[PDB]
Every structure is written in C-alpha cells, then in structure tokens.
Amino acid sequence: MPGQLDPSTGRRFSEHKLCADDECSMLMYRGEALEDFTGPDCRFVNFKKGDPVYVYYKLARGWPEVWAGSVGRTFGYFPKDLIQVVHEYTKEELQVPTDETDFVCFDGGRDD
C-alpha cells in the first residue's frame, strides 16, 4: 500500500507464500475451478467452473483465501475460494517469502 491504490490493479497476494516445497517447484494440490472468473489483472489466473487448475503454492494464511497456479494459458494468483481441490500431492506447507518483483507486470503495471 503506497499511500494510494489503483482500483483496477490487484496486489501481490501476500508477503509470504506457502509451498509444497521450500523452492515452490513442487505441486501442493490439484484443483478445479467451480466458479467462473477472469484475470485481467495481468498475473491473476483466469478460469471458470469446470476448468482444471494446478496449485503450485498458496498464500500464508490470508482472506480472501487466495492460491496460485497455472490454468490453460494463465498462471499466477487467484481466489482459492473460486476453486476446489480435486486432489492433493502433499499436506505440506513450507513458508517461502515472496519477492516484491516475484510476480510483477512490466509495461503498464503498478510497481507501487
């Protein structure tokens, strides 16, 4: 929060991300989207009800509950609330910190 906030731009989810592995290279769960949705926020994940998702990592305790993964041609962050775990590889939750530019958008993206 840089004093002001652009309504049309989302935030970098959370300061810490929970991963199935400390390098977040291993899948945690596999999910399916039980809700229609769009990710115009550049790094949001687009999906809709009936869209299979993969969840690489998730937020370290945050509401609205938000997760991250890849769906179709979109990969990034999205509301966990908008999907359902269709299966999981691990119950492991390693707390890896997020970089400020870990998930950013160049040319037409809020760095603030």
Side-chain angles (χ1 to χ4, degrees), residues 7 13 32 44-45 53 79 86 89 94 96 98 105 109:
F13 37 105
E32 80 193 276
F44 242 127
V45 163
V53 332
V86 76
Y89 312 95
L94 277 141
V96 187
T98 59
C105 295

Side-chain angles (χ1 to χ4, degrees), residues 35-110:
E35 198 50 86
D36 191 279
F37 188 42
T38 300
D41 198 50
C42 171
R43 27 75 208 254
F44 242 127
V45 163
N46 314 32
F47 56 62
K48 72 185 65 179
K49 40 167 49 179
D51 234 286
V53 332
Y54 302 65
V55 15
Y56 291 107
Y57 76 89
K58 62 193 196 173
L59 277 58
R61 306 308 308 140
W63 216 71
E65 51 192 74
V66 159
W67 279 11
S70 52
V71 189
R73 44 67 65 155
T74 33
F75 47 93
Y77 80 137
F78 61 91
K80 162 211 185 296
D81 189 68
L82 262 55
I83 73 123
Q84 158 67 82
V85 160
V86 76
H87 187 75
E88 93 280 83
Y89 312 95
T90 191
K91 293 300 199 302
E92 287 171 85
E93 301 173 282
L94 277 141
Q95 212 197 270
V96 187
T98 59
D99 183 72
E100 51 188 295
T101 54
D102 202 18
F103 295 74
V104 284
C105 295
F106 299 85
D107 180 74
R110 292 292 182 198

Side-chain angles (χ1 to χ4, degrees), residues 1-11 41 43 109-110 112:
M1 183 58 178
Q4 295 71 214
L5 215 296
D6 189 307
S8 64
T9 54
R11 304 307 300 168
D41 198 50
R43 27 75 208 254
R110 292 292 182 198
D112 55 294

Side-chain angles (χ1 to χ4, degrees), residues 13-45:
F13 37 105
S14 193
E15 302 168 68
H16 303 270
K17 55 185 175 183
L18 298 183
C19 307
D21 187 277
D22 172 89
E23 58 185 77
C24 313
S25 183
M26 300 184 185
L27 272 180
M28 315 185 74
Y29 321 78
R30 180 178 177 159
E32 80 193 276
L34 288 200
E35 198 50 86
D36 191 279
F37 188 42
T38 300
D41 198 50
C42 171
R43 27 75 208 254
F44 242 127
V45 163

